[PDB]
Amino acid sequence: SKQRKRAVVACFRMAPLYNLPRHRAVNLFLQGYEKSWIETEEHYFEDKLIEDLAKPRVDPLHQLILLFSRTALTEKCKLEEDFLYMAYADIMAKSCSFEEKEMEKQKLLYQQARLHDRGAAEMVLQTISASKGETGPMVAATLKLGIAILNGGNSTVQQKMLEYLKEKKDVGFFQSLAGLMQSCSVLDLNAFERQNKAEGLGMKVLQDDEFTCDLFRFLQLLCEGHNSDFQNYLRTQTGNNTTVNIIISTVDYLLRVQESISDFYWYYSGKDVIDEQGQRNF
Amino acid sequence: ILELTEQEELLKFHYHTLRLYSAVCALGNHRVAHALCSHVDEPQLLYAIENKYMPGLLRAGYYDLLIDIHLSSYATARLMMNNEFIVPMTEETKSITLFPDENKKHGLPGIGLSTSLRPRMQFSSPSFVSINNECYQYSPEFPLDILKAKTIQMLTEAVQEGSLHARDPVGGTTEFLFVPLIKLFYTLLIMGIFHNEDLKHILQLIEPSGLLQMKLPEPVKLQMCLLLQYLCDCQVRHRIEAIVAFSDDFVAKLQDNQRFRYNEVMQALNECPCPEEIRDQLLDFHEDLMTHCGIELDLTIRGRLLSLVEKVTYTLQQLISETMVRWAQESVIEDPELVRAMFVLLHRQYDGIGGLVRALPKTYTINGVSVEDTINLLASLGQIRSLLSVEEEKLMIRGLGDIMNNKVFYQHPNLMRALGMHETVMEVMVNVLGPKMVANCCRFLCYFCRISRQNQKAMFDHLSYLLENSSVGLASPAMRGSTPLDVAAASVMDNNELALALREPDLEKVVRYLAGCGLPVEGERYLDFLRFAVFCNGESVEENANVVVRLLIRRPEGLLAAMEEAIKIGNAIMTFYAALIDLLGRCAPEMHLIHAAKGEAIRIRSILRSLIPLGDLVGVISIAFQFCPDHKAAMVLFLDRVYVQDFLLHLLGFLPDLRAAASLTDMALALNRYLCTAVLPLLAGTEHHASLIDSLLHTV
Amino acid sequence: GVEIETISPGDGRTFPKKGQTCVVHYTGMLQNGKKFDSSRDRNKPFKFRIGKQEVIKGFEEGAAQMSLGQRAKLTCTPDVAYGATGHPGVIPPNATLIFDVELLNLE
Amino acid sequence: LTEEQIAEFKEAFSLFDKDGDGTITTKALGTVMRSLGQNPTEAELQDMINEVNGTIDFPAFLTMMARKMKDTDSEEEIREAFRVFDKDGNGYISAAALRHVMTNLGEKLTDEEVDEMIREADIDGQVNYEAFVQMMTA
Amino acid sequence: ECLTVPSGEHEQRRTVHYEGGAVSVHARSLWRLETLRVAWSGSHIR
Amino acid sequence: IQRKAIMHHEGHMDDGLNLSRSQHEESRTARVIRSTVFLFNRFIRGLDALSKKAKTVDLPIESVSLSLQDLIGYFHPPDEHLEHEDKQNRLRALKNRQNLFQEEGMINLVLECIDRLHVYSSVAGREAGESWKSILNSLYELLAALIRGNRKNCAQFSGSLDWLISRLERLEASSGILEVLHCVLVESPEALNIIKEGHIKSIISLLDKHGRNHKVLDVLCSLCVCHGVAVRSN
């Protein structure tokens, strides 16, 4: 194509190799060093930390969780970003032979026990209900923590959340779930086409994907172990005011993704040798 | 005053008077601050420092007046520049060694190397004589070392008395004892005072490695938390100055290495050296250094970085990690601001790597020549960033005009978007709208957009907002380089990539704003923006073009004869239909059509056949012999794309061009203009050859 | 216009000349005894230039009358002050000024 | 772009400016260019003024000066880039070495581009590079 | 959309209207039911 | 949409009226609205009777003061001793009540009630109008109640600032106006951009009449600085 040809001319144009007067090179070295090197591993410290907070009077961890619980209970009409919360959600969420399965059940269940004594389910459950349909990185951090709590399918946390939503009766949580599931993604029709031609000329598509794989894995991890009360509660939603039959909504999201996969089929229905980008997206 | 300590009505009223005096001179009213310096009687505050029998109310009031009059402006000025980390490149900067002489401990962070910029202050004298812009000067002045030594004495005093748990202390509460004193010391620490001689003394007072191990109320340790956080930031400043000092040694080795390697490969007479030629031909120095640094990941010089990464691993951190947890344990805490300030430092002591990640895409190296322009530009930028939080527009325009005239603004165009100052400018513009201030701000951003390429990406990230205020751009000769719409138009022109990268709801906004033009002059500016939105290199895209033409077949809004009605009646409708015919001429190219039928390209091109059905030729002949130079070229470009040689010769003339070879004078604007417009018809003939030879002799 | 009483003389006769920087320690108050400014009080010899004409006019008439080390009271007219408006913020409109000026050194 | 060239251009433009808001006269363009050593013809000066109102602005001046500089720089760079290879001094490129060095960093896409070069290069195989320049630059 | 009666400072509010949007949640979109019977007035609604 | 309702023998397809129930406090406040309007129009008509002509012709007094103390208690801000969750529940209910009185326009009704009241200095048989000071004081305190939370209601209210600064110098009930003005000027910078020079001169004048009020200095401090920013000219 056209601009690729001037790009090749520009690839010949970068003949200043290391003229680079004295400090442009140092500046670009700083850029490359920060980009490539500092992404390292220090991340053993999460187990040490969440051990170290639960050393008793109320726990410091319980003060922190209670802080975010009261902050979530304030009314804002739009959530903030709060990189305090964005740090500590990940800090908590990184803390999770037949004999080996015996051991790895119990260590995981103890690590969840470290949290859901401290009202830890309800901060996640409320901060979901705060943002009504907004899809910020806030909500992604909350769902990562909510998965890392319910990872094994603790029945006590499932019962904890059901007792919560039966007492402090809220439709705004289910309204928030419907508002989330309304967008979440579809695949694509045309942004792949534009993406491919921009890719070819200049030298994303599913930028909201891993959020959806966390949201539905979260909803899976609310009915792990067949909480038949809680499976019925999603459908009919009695104790609140107005019901939101969430299961027809997730059927509709599946129908959306179905249709867009089908439309991706027709675009490769004839050329039959699929690019790296098509496979990687697909 | 010391007898007022029980006249409680008078006490409360005078406390509110001090509250009001503090409240008035908020954020840089030096004009009012000199007047208070007349009223406040400068040594009386120094006396109210030490009066150990005043009430704590008036104690806090006078320390707040001291800070608010004499300290607040430059305190904020360094509060803004805590996070910029720019640094020169001299051997003084290279003199930094990261560490106390191959020890096994930290630096005890009161080290006075400080090769960074860290902008500086001036002071006015509050004498009452005629004006020397003294009310509008820097700030009222005050003594420094008197404050320094006496506050150190106050600190050691308050420690070695209050730790013994006196039932006295000065303002009843220890809160009224410590809180304004610690607040004053905190503000005075930031201002570059308390050098190393007394840094050692205060860190003997607090470190011993004491102050922090006392028993406290809540806002005392809130202030202590802020103190400790500033110490962490000083650690970061020292760390980054040291790593620039390392890189100054390291980079020249790599420079000499790869130039030497090039001359090695050049010198040899032995295909297989062609991959070395490939490796020496990255896109810029970016991928060059990317290969040079990623090669050390999995040359013996790479061992020095292998050392230095572990050198910049980093026991103040560990005592913080104790005492924050201890405060959370023993002393169950209300005041959720204190809880937030607790855990921010707690997380930050472990996220030193991640804070360093946050830090390094702001630091920057500058040659020793351009130092004063960097200081002056940064001072003006701090001025306008201070003016962000309020006559005012004239100060703004002065600041912008100072910014417009700097070498470093062009010598380091990375640094401007590194400051984020464009976002500051745009926030000011947001604050204006619901004057000519906007006309200067749009002018600065359009002036700013073109100075590199990747600048325009960062400018492009606001176009969702930026189109929404299109109705400001109206009938004014101060419109080019003045509309926010013109800022969006500045955000496109070069990049083929970013022209692709925008999406359809922006164009939905545009055509909703354009559908209201069912009368105007204002439509031609929208059409100018769309003309930038479709074409973009000399060869149009189709992806924007399909959507544009589709939404215009919604509502374009006898139209051929309407232009040919009102010529002689005021250029508005004339240039309007010129712009509308210029826009539609930027669709359906030939490389995807004339080479091969691509389906929908035919049907868009048929829609283009469907409108203005070659009655354009009336406009072709009617213009050319009278408005004259401009509109006809747009008609040509409409004909050149959508729409043999007999019909070519049907169209006929350049005789009026040759007829004014010396008498002109807008006729002198079509002269070279159709020396590139009448060249598209390369793809009565003797008469045209005669007229062309007449123009050739006119250019002989 | 100014009514200069020599509080304490210097030598009386060595009054300055133009082009000379005048070293003072003034502590001016109002007619009503309200103190507002004192160049004593910030520990700083205020300096100015006769002929450059920055200081106010009665203070300037006293600037050529006092001598080397002479202290005097420069009672001035509120016409010769900041004026019928007065200083915006400090001096009220038409405040009759009463000073205490001590001229010290020259250059 | 180099730094002190930008410094000199800024200093010359402001030197022949008086008020300082990017407003010099049109006729002082020839004076400021001949202070910068630039002297094109009269019609080219007029075409560059018509490329720009009466007050010559700063960045587009830098852009046009960048065009005039990067012209000669592009010639010397296409000189030095093929003085990397071909040590004899004839500017002649063998097609196997074209298959080698055409897959260089920067673009480095697939066999489509190197077949696109080899289908039309003229190959006697030592190929003159100016045919490659005329090919790539439209 | 909800049934409404026009706003403050009118007719003395004797006309009837419809209105969509946020007047529905608000005050004057509200109506009290009455039936004929004195006894069992608070019964169900059929 | 002002889609006018009429009856018809058939109607259209789009006469599908859907149902949704109210809440308990909403019904409570609405019945309070009807009782409140129904009292105050009686009160206004009694003042219109005893203003122009001198009659006996009767007027509601003690039921009005009783209802007024009731509505003072009804908008009481929640305390310092409550659970933070319950504090914000009750605060939410408080703002919902304030907004539902805002939209129905009770504020201007109370304001014109002040206008008709603020006439003489102790018209009527003044045995009955003996509590005049108390009635105006409670009306100013109620007017202070209906603002203190809502940004939008006070910024809407901010047009009538001029009447308040006009009535600032009554020397009789001015503390109520000063408290109302303070609570307005805290929470809306829209109001701060409105106020002008002679208003401030009048406020300083009221300080120059009524001794040394610390409240006045709080007012000037509030007028000096916005939620985060300052205004230079003031």
Swiss-Prot record, chain C:
Family annotation (SUPFAM superfamilies): FKBP-like (SSF54534)
Q: Name one GO biological process term.
A: T cell proliferation
Task: Indicate yes or no for the key word Cytoplasm.
Answer: yes
Q: Which residues form a coiled coil?
A: none
> Which Enzyme Commission number(s) are on file for it?
5.2.1.8
PROSITE patterns for the chain: FKBP_PPIASE
Primary localization class, coarse: cytoplasm
- Which domain of life does the protein's organism represent? Eukaryota
- In which tissues is this gene expressed? Detected in heart muscle (at protein level). Isoform 1 and isoform 2 are ubiquitous with highest levels in brain and thymus.
Signal peptide segment: none
* Annotated compartments: Cytoplasm; Sarcoplasmic reticulum
So what does this thing catalyse?
[protein]-peptidylproline (omega=180) = [protein]-peptidylproline (omega=0)
Q: Which Pfam families match?
A: FKBP_C (PF00254)
Q: What InterPro entries does the database record attribute to this sequence?
A: FKBP-type_PPIase, PPIase_dom_sf, PPIase_FKBP_dom
Sorted alphabetically, which keywords does the UniProt record give? Answer: Cytoplasm, Isomerase, Rotamase, Sarcoplasmic reticulum
Q: Please give one Gene Ontology molecular function term for this protein.
A: transmembrane transporter binding
The Gene Ontology CC terms held by the record are: calcium channel complex; cytoplasm; membrane; sarcoplasmic reticulum membrane; Z disc
Q: What does the record say about activity regulation?
A: Inhibited by both FK506 and rapamycin.
Q: How does it assemble?
A: Identified in a complex composed of RYR2, FKBP1B, PKA catalytic subunit, PRKAR2A, AKAP6, and the protein phosphatases PP2A and PP1. Interacts directly with RYR2.
Q: What does this protein do?
A: Has the potential to contribute to the immunosuppressive and toxic effects of FK506 and rapamycin. PPIases accelerate the folding of proteins. It catalyzes the cis-trans isomerization of proline imidic peptide bonds in oligopeptides.
Give the UniProt family note: Belongs to the FKBP-type PPIase family. FKBP1 subfamily.
What this protein is called in its record is Peptidyl-prolyl cis-trans isomerase FKBP1B
Native species of this protein?
Answer: Homo sapiens
Q: What is the lineage of its organism?
A: Eukaryota, Metazoa, Chordata, Craniata, Vertebrata
The coding gene here is FKBP1B
From Swiss-Prot, chain D:
**Mind telling me what this protein is named?**
Calmodulin-1
Which GO-annotated molecular functions does the record name? adenylate cyclase activator activity; calcium channel inhibitor activity; calcium channel regulator activity; calcium ion binding; calcium-dependent protein binding; protein kinase binding; protein phosphatase activator activity; protein serine/threonine kinase activator activity
Keywords in alphabetical order: Acetylation, Calcium, Cell projection, Cilium, Cytoplasm, Cytoskeleton, Disease variant, Flagellum, Host-virus interaction, Isopeptide bond, Long QT syndrome, Metal-binding, Methylation, Phosphoprotein, Repeat, Ubl conjugation
Which residues are listed for Ca(2+) 4 binding in this entry? D122, D124, Q126, A131
Thylakoid recorded as keyword:
no
Where does cross-link Glycyl lysine isopeptide (Lys-Gly) (interchain with G-Cter in ubiquitin) occur? K18
Similarity annotation: Belongs to the calmodulin family.
Which positions are annotated as binding Ca(2+) 1? Answer: D17, D19, D21, T23, A28
Q: How is its activity regulated?
A: (Microbial infection) Inactivated by S.flexneri OspC1 and OspC3 proteins, which specifically bind the apo-form of calmodulin, thereby preventing calcium-binding and activity.
Query: How does it associate, per the subunit comment?
Result: Homotetramer. Interacts with MYO1C, MYO5A and RRAD. Interacts with MYO10. Interacts with CEP97, CCP110, TTN/titin and SRY. Interacts with USP6; the interaction is calcium dependent. Interacts with CDK5RAP2. Interacts with SCN5A. Interacts with RYR1. Interacts with FCHO1. Interacts with MIP in a 1:2 stoichiometry; the interaction with the cytoplasmic domains from two MIP subunits promotes MIP water channel closure. Interacts with ORAI1; this may play a role in the regulation of ORAI1-mediated calcium transport. Interacts with IQCF1. Interacts with SYT7. (Microbial infection) Interacts with Rubella virus protease/methyltransferase p150.
**Which is one Pfam family of this protein?**
EF-hand_7
Regarding domains, what does the record say? The N-terminal and C-terminal lobes of CALM bind to the C-terminus of KCNQ1 in a clamp-like conformation. Binding of CALM C-terminus to KCNQ1 is calcium-independent but is essential for assembly of the structure. Binding of CALM N-terminus to KCNQ1 is calcium-dependent and regulates electrophysiological activity of the channel. The C-lobe interacts with KCNN4 channels in a calcium-independent manner, whereas the N-lobe interacts with the S4-S5 linker of KCNN4 in a calcium-dependent manner playing a role as calcium sensor and gating the channel.
Return the InterPro entries for the record.
CALM/Myosin/TropC-like, EF-hand-dom_pair, EF_Hand_1_Ca_BS, EF_hand_dom
For this chain, the site of the Glycyl lysine isopeptide (Lys-Gly) (interchain with G-Cter in SUMO2) cross-link is K18
What is the protein's species of origin? Homo sapiens (Human)
Outcome following mutation: D122G: In LQT14; reduction in calcium affinity; not changed protein abundance; not changed structure; significantly decreased thermal stability in presence of calcium; significantly decreased RYR2 interaction; increased ryanodine-sensitive calcium-release channel activity; decreased of KCNN2 calcium-activated potassium channel activity; not changed KCNN2 expression; not changed KCNN2 location at membrane
Q: Which SUPFAM superfamilies does the annotation name?
A: EF-hand (SSF47473)
